[PDB]
Curated annotation (Swiss-Prot), chain B:
It comes from the Viruses. Changing F7L: In strain: A23.1, Omicron/BA.2.75. Attaches the virion to the cell membrane by interacting with host receptor, initiating the infection. The major receptor is host ACE2. When S2/S2' has been cleaved, binding to the receptor triggers direct fusion at the cell membrane. When S2/S2' has not been cleaved, binding to the receptor results in internalization of the virus by endocytosis using host TFRC and GRM2 and leading to fusion of the virion membrane with the host endosomal membrane. Alternatively, may use NRP1/NRP2 and integrin as entry receptors. It comes from Severe acute respiratory syndrome coronavirus 2 (2019-nCoV). Binds to host ACE2. RBD also interacts with the N-linked glycan on 'Asn-90' of ACE2. Cleavage of S generates a polybasic C-terminal sequence on S1 that binds to host Neuropilin-1 (NRP1) and Neuropilin-2 (NRP2) receptors. Interacts with host integrin alpha-5/beta-1 (ITGA5:ITGB1) and with ACE2 in complex with integrin alpha-5/beta-1 (ITGA5:ITGB1). May interact via cytoplasmic c-terminus with M protein. May interact (via N-terminus) with host bilirubin and biliverdin, thereby preventing antibody binding to the SARS-CoV-2 spike NTD via an allosteric mechanism. This is Spike protein S1. Glycans are attached at N15. Residues 1-14 are annotated as: Disordered. Changing R27K: Partial loss of biliverdin affinity.
Length: 50, 30
């Protein structure tokens, strides 16, 4: 939901920890052009822990 | 301190993988 994203050469990174990783809120945004996952499965991503 | 305007305990910054905040004659600790 950020209003401005950084450029690709100066990409900004945020750390997510000590919270409830509810990935279901991501789907409320616009339809994603690409949602390729590697290793992890988006269907049961909430079931695993990281 | 000469309030508490200096934190020269550390010299630089790094990963900073974790952060936690809470409330602070004999006080034992383990
Ligand atoms: C968050 O997304 C909504 C649309 O899903 C948008 O209307 C809103 O402006 C966004 N928030 C910010 C702070 O831009």
């Amino acid at each position: 939901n950020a209003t401005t994203f950084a450029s690709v050469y100066a990409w900004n990174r945020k750390r997510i920890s000590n919270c409830v990783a509810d990935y279901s809120v991501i789907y409320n945004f616009a339809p994603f052009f690409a949602f390729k996952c590697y290793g992890v499965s988006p269907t049961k991503l909430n079931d695993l822990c990281f | 301190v000469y309030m508490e305007s200096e934190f020269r305990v550390y010299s630089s910054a790094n990963n900073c993988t974790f952060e936690y905040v809470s409330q602070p004659n004999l006080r034992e600790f383990v």
